[PDB]
Amino acid sequence: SMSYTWTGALITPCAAEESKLPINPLSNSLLRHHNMVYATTSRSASLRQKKVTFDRLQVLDDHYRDVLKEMKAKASTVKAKLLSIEEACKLTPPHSAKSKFGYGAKDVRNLSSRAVNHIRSVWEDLLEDTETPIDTTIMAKSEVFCVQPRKPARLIVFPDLGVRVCEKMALYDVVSTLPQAVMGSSYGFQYSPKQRVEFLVNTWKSKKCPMGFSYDTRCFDSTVTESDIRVEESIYQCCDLAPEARQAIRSLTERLYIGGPLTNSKGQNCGYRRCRASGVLTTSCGNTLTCYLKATAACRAAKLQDCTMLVNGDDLVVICESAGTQEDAAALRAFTEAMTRYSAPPGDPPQPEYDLELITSCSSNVSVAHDASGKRVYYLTRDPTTPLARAAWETARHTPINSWLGNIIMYAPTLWARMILMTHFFSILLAQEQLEKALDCQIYGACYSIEPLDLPQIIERLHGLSAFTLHSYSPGEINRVASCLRKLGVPPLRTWRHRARSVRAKLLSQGGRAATCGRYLFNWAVRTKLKLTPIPAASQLDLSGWFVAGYSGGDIYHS
Numbered sequence: 314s315m316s317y318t319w320t321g322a323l324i325t326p327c328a329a330e331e332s333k334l335p336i337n338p339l340s341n342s343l344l345r346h347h348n349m350v351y352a353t354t355s356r357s358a359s360l361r362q363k364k365v366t367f368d369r370l371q372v373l374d375d376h377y378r379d380v381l382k383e384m385k386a387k388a389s390t391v392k393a394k395l396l397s398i399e400e401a402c403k404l405t406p407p408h409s410a411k412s413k414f415g416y417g418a419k420d421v422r423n424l425s426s427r428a429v430n431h432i433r434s435v436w437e438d439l440l441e442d443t444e445t446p447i448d449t450t451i452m453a454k455s456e457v458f459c460v461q462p463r464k465p466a467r468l469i470v471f472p473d474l475g476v477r478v479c480e481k482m483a484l485y486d487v488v489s490t491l492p493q494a495v496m497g498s499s500y501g502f503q504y505s506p507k508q509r510v511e512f513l514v515n516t517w518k519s520k521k522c523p524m525g526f527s528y529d530t531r532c533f534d535s536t537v538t539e540s541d542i543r544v545e546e547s548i549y550q551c552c553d554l555a556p557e558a559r560q561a562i563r564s565l566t567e568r569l570y571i572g573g574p575l576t577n578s579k580g581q582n583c584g585y586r587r588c589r590a591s592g593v594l595t596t597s598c599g600n601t602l603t604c605y606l607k608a609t610a611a612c613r614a615a616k617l618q619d620c621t622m623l624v625n626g627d628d629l630v631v632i633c634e635s636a637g638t639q640e641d642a643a644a645l646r647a648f649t650e651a652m653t654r655y656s657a658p659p660g661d662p663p664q665p666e667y668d669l670e671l672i673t674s675c676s677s678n679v680s681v682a683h684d685a686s687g688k689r690v691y692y693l694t695r696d697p698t699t700p701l702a703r704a705a706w707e708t709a710r711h712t713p714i715n716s717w718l719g720n721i722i723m724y725a726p727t728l729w730a731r732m733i734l735m736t737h738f739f740s741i742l743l744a745q746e747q748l749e750k751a752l753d754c755q756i757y758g759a760c761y762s763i764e765p766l767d768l769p770q771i772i773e774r775l776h777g778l779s780a781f782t783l784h785s786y787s788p789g790e791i792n793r794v795a796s797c798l799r800k801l802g803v804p805p806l807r808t809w810r811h812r813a814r815s816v817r818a819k820l821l822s823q824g825g826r827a828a829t830c831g832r833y834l835f836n837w838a839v840r841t842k843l844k845l846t847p848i849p850a851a852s853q854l855d856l857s858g859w860f861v862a863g864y865s866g867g868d869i870y871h872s
């Protein structure tokens with residue numbers, strides 16, 4: 314069937330849309346080529362609609378069925394709990410889209426009678442009506458990028474807030490626990506950046522002759538078929554579940570997940586969806602299961618040897634045993650045809666890699682540096698282009714989500730995050746005296762409230778003390794960074810070193826947590842380094858839950 318059907322009504326915006334980076338003294342200090350940074354808007358919607366609209370091809374074989382049974386057998390060991398309205402309400406982001414039924418996210422979090430009453434009626438409707446399609450709003454997503462030698466906006470589809478709260482009640486525990494139980498070490502969201510690096514490295518070193526490849530599926534969500542969504546549900550149904558939960562999952566699958574009507578911001582019928590909606594609770598879990606299922610079966614079909622997979626939603630990386638140069642290439646080609654038959658056609662043609670560092674997965678790659686003792690240490694890094702473009706943007710325009718805080722946390726050990734992100738943002742937080750003001754950011758799709766002054770401990774817990782002493786980065790990494798800066802008009806690293814010294818000093822002067830930031834975060838700036846010892850409060854942080862599952866588009870907030 315067609316992934317989408319359009320009536321012709323436009324995908325409209327529900328407010329003005331900013332698309333250019335403002336000329337701002339603060340952002341200009343970070344990146345000068347402001348015309349190279351842009352944000353996607355609804356104006357490019359019709360271009361994305363054209364790319365995601367096509368008839369799907371799907372042929373299932375024995376390998377597929379064998380893998381499905383193996384997964385369901387593992388899903389059988391799970392017992393998921395039904396969440397109370399209260400718990401589900403507490404999981405709602407303070408700035409989540411307001412309902413069209415007289416209440417907003419604040420009301421849901423406060424458990425106001427109106428919100429809670431409407432939520433119950435939605436739940437009860439789910440238990441009674443097993444077929445009426447549920448409404449969804451389709452919007453053009455606003456994302457920031459750097460021009461290329463442009464990207465059309467992504468399309469986000471989501472149901473009303475009442476429904477989103479009901480999804481949590483029935484499936485929050487499921488999508489938070491089942492992936493791991495079914496996929497084991499192959500489930501990516503269970504790892505922190507350091508654990509992910511450890512898994513990829515260990516997996517690589519375990520092969521007699523490693524060969525790896527990332528596999529980019531062409532617009533994954535639109536490739537998910539009705540059969541994929543029912544197969545996915547047949548997996549969830551193996552969990553021990555409360556009666557109402559089992560029914561809510563059954564109704565939600567047929568009324569929301571397999572597809573439904575699309576309505577624009579103006580209230581006009583835009584068309585219909587018969588594929589994965591990006592904004593429902595099961596998108597991340599469902600995509601990871603679907604991708605893992607097809608890929609695992611595809612490997613057997615292609616005769617790839619000892620396939621180890623790491624999956625995060627639609628992002629897939631595979632590490633296996635080489636059978637020779639020509640053999641690997643032929644087998645990779647058969648792998649791709651197998652996925653295509655499963656309705657997971659390729660975007661960028663996959664290529665076999667024999668150098669672990671040359672493999673990009675989840676937009677990142679493993680690289681190497683050295684700690685104080687001179688010992689080698691693997692860490693996760695990426696092309697800083699997008700992070701830098703977004704940092705500039707978030708500096709000139711106040712944004713709800715601060716990707717820079719999240720990039721600092723996730724890429725703390727990198728050359729660019731240390732010399733540029735930490736320096737730029739701490740310098741600004743000092744100038745405006747807002748070092749103690751908590752900010753919102755996202756980790757694996759989940760929204761978190763974080764205080765900048767807690768970065769030292771957080772970084773220590775997630776990456777270890779070595780994140781504050783890495784030096785002697787690799788030539789390729791250093792060159793990718795420098796090259797990136799020249800392209801975007803970002804002052805050269807030498808300049809950032811100089812700015813860092815001034816920042817560090819100011820931080821120490823203030824003492825307290827502020828001084829701790831100067832000591833650990835900017836120890837790389839001074840030539841006469843300090844002895845960095847374990848931070849007290851670090852071994853006490855409750856980082857339980859930060860890396861459990863993916864919640865992209867799941868409207869999740871963790872307090």
Ligand SMILES: Cc1cc(NS(=O)(=O)c2cc(Cl)c(Cl)cc2Cl)no1
Nearest residue numbers: 509625675719720723755756757758
């Ligand atoms: C920050 C940030 C990004 C994020 N989610 S994500 O961009 O999908 C992501 C980031 C990283 Cl680093 C890895 Cl290894 C894997 C994933 Cl899937 N969560 O926090």
Ligand SMILES: Cc1cc(NS(=O)(=O)c2cc(Cl)c(Cl)cc2Cl)no1
Nearest residue numbers: 728731783784785791806807810837
């Ligand atoms: C972090 C960090 C900084 C550092 N040394 S540094 O002198 O600041 C530095 C490193 C590199 Cl690689 C470049 Cl191109 C330029 C500079 Cl000025 N080592 O790790």
